[PDB]
Design a binder for this molecule. Structure first.
Ligand SMILES: CC(=O)N[C@H]1[C@H](O[C@@H]2[C@H](O[C@]3(C(=O)O)C[C@H](O)[C@@H](NC(C)=O)[C@H]([C@H](O)[C@H](O)CO)O3)[C@@H](O)[C@H](O[C@H]3[C@H](O)[C@@H](O)[C@H](O)O[C@@H]3CO)O[C@@H]2CO)O[C@H](CO)[C@H](O)[C@@H]1O
Ligand SMILES: CC(=O)N[C@H]1[C@H](O[C@@H]2[C@H](O[C@]3(C(=O)O)C[C@H](O)[C@@H](NC(C)=O)[C@H]([C@H](O)[C@H](O)CO)O3)[C@@H](O)[C@H](O[C@H]3[C@H](O)[C@@H](O)[C@H](O)O[C@@H]3CO)O[C@@H]2CO)O[C@H](CO)[C@H](O)[C@@H]1O
Ligand SMILES: CC(=O)N[C@H]1[C@H](O[C@@H]2[C@H](O[C@]3(C(=O)O)C[C@H](O)[C@@H](NC(C)=O)[C@H]([C@H](O)[C@H](O)CO)O3)[C@@H](O)[C@H](O[C@H]3[C@H](O)[C@@H](O)[C@H](O)O[C@@H]3CO)O[C@@H]2CO)O[C@H](CO)[C@H](O)[C@@H]1O
Lengths: 204, 205, 205
């Protein structure tokens, strides 16, 4: 080789011509006498609800995060020291972001006291894809949320309009507790409940 | 002449032939077309809304609009019942918060209503700028999607009677949102004063 | 002497003069300040809250606090009406869920109220550790931001009368949140028993 071009360089100090390769020190280095990249970049992974769409090399929020549906089939338990019963219900469930929504269709139940508790046992009854743990609230604050239910008290053929205030109050080993603090009331033998929804924070 | 070399450059005089080569990291680079080239150049991913890349500061973030996007719908609130139906001019405030759509009703005075009935909002037209009809479509068919109470005053021959109305988001069909009034307390009346109220439902558009 | 040269290295014997040169990929590398450098070194982006980089596992995630952040406000709930106003000592639970702020009221006994009025919460002081006054600012000026019902019992000369109160989040001004009580059912009374209730509004802080 007669002469050389950059990056290649020849330095002829002390009557001895020596060839050397020139690189950007920030970009490269020599490791085990070979040109190596300095800091090879490892691409991060993503935790749900963030996901990598490998097909289009795109990071996105999972679709299910905005909406995940399900159903719970079981017995709605009403609890009061002087009165308690079980009614067969099917409620719709929807996970919207960090919230769990419960949707009750209309229902006819036995009579209730001026106040009381409703208990939903998620230990069993959940539709496919759902685990009991998926219904656990993300806080122990009481109440997590309150809503009103519109009811009709049935007493000797007449239907009497009233309301019931409902609060999500507790979750214990898969048992969700919805307190009925009260509302308007009259003596009755049976209750007609219009549809209603209740939701609470849930980050599972 | 070039007397000697330094790494990466190496001279192996193997098989009676003094030959020069350039030593590189086998996994970082590979020669192709007789030029040093990067073995696996990394393509950086793109981002789907609400994730966005702030190119100015090279920062990935959640879009601001995702947390809050406001709007208005101007149109006629339709009340529907077989024995009574009417249209009232309203302007509703709308707000997209995350994967929820909130509807905000200001106070209103309407004609009388039956013990139960439907409210229909036609989003086909009336939305403010930036909003499309499709933007109001719920993300589920569950009925009801959400329920709330509206506080009302029934006007009947001069006296104002306080009552409530339960409202549920029940259906969306080709831009028509249906809000069912299942019932609540009631009395015979000439007109209804509605206090303000909000209702929201899941919406991932 | 060097007999031969291996790629990347190549020699061009153009006009009886052998010129040694380094062969590199035109798009992968370049020559700056007479040295091999990288053509477009890729800078990895940073992340704005609620997105965060877990450096320990090199994983991008949504911060846990985004789904749930709790707190408390201790202060005096102010009831306001031109003909009646009072202050009651309360402790409210707060929870930030995504882009929402939830306020949780436990049961309470207060003085009597008018047919309508305002509740004011002064967040300027009283917030638990980690919380700033600005953290309670709504993300919209829409009125109402949200409405809910509170179940009450009016105490009127020994008898307890069940009724409801409609509550709307209406305004936030320099740390003072205003919750309007538009009305609801009513009767003359001496004191009010309030059942627990929650109210939430959009908040992207
Ligand atoms: C409309 C009706 O039959 N009402 C009965 C009630 O019947 C049950 C069920 O109706 C509802 C209801 O309208 O109250 C529907 C609703 O989705 C359910 N609510 C929830 C939250 O899931 C409730 C609820 O589970 C119960 O009322 C609580 O006690 O029930 C009917 O759809 C169901 O109908 C079957 C018919 O009886 C049968 O002839 C037909 O072939 O098949 C359908 C099912 O596909 O029957 C349910 C029986 O419980 O029952 C209550 C007493 O439990 C009262 O008598 C209502 O008057
Ligand atoms: C206060 C009042 O005028 N009330 C009338 C009502 O007037 C309409 C509107 O008022 C409100 C209301 O307070 O009832 C405001 C509210 O934001 C609206 N609510 C919703 C959910 O959109 C309602 C609602 O649209 C109607 O009640 C439907 O019945 O209405 C007034 O702000 C508006 O005022 C105009 C004046 O009439 C006009 O002189 C002035 O120059 O401009 C203002 C602003 O454009 O008028 C509205 C329509 O009349 O109207 C109802 C009957 O529709 C009753 O008569 C109320 O008593
Ligand atoms: C005694 C009682 O339970 N009810 C009193 C009320 O007493 C206050 C407080 O109770 C509650 C209540 O249930 O009414 C609890 C509740 O969480 C509070 N609500 C909110 C939203 O913060 C309310 C609210 O502060 C008031 O109703 C406003 O008027 O209060 C009691 O737990 C508390 O108990 C203390 C003992 O009295 C004291 O001897 C002991 O040393 O410490 C405990 C705990 O600090 O007392 C509270 C006093 O206000 O008070 C109201 C009048 O303010 C009525 O008399 C209720 O009947």
């Amino acid at each position: 080789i007669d002469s050389v071009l950059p990056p290649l360089t020849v330095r002829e100090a002390s009557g001895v011509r020596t060839l050397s390769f020139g690189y950007d020190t920030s970009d490269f280095t020599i490791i085990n006498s070979v040109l190596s990249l300095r800091s090879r970049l490892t691409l991060p992974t993503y935790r749900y609800p963030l996901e990598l769409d490998t097909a289009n090399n795109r990071v996105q929020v999972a679709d299910r995060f905005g909406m995940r549906t399900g159903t719970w089939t079981g017995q709605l338990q009403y609890q009061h020291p002087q009165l308690s019963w079980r009614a067969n219900v099917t409620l719709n469930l929807m996970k919207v972001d960090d919230w769990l929504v419960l949707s009750f269709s209309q229902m006819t139940t036995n009579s209730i006291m001026a106040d009381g508790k409703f208990v939903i046992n998620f230990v069993s009854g959940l539709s496919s894809g759902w685990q009991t743990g998926d219904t656990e609230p993300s806080s122990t604050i009481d109440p997590l949320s309150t809503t009103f239910a519109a009811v009709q008290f049935l007493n000797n053929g007449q239907r009497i309009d009233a309301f019931r205030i409902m609060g999500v109050s507790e979750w214990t080993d898969g048992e969700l507790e919805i307190k009925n603090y009260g509302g308007t009331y009259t003596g009755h033998t049976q209750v007609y409940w219009a549809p209603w929804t209740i939701m609470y924070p849930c980050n599972v």
